[PDB]
């Protein structure tokens, strides 16, 4: 029950990984979803792969 502005995330140019699967990252603002789940953590670098 909240609008997701993915342009703020995608065009931030601060995130070191932008990996989208099944959905193009430029069309996240054009499709919409029943729910989205967010999991936020800190992990090492050789392991974000």
């Amino acid at each position, epitope marked *: 029950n909240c609008v997701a502005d993915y342009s703020v995330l995608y*065009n931030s140019a601060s995130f*070191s990984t932008f990996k989208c699967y099944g959905v193009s990252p430029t069309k996240l603002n054009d499709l919409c979803f029943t729910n989205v789940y967010a999991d936020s953590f800190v992990i090492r670098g050789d392991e974000v792969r």
Partner: nanobody
Amino acid sequence: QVQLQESGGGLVQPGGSLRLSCAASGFTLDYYAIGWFRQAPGKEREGVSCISSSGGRTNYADSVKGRFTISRDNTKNTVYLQMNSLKPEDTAVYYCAAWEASRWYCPLQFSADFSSWGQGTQVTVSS
């Protein structure tokens, strides 16, 4: 199966020249923008040079103006970086990274996410 592979690293004399290669397998490198990045011993990974997908836009770090020349071959799926007048300050491991523009505007001067990375190659400048 997407791979980025650097080549051409080695040991050179200061004032000499060296030439690196970055080749892509499993995907077509022409649509991606490619940038060459190095980390010096005890330093953070700085942006050496970048080139657009079509090659019409380029950017270089001020330390390397007039010395390094970047270019690409979209038919051969490779991006090249020529180094001339090489200095001990440039001793570092060199990565090639491929990504897409995350901001409006043609130029590649800004930094952003880098989708794919190589394993890096070593160029040492010492004499």
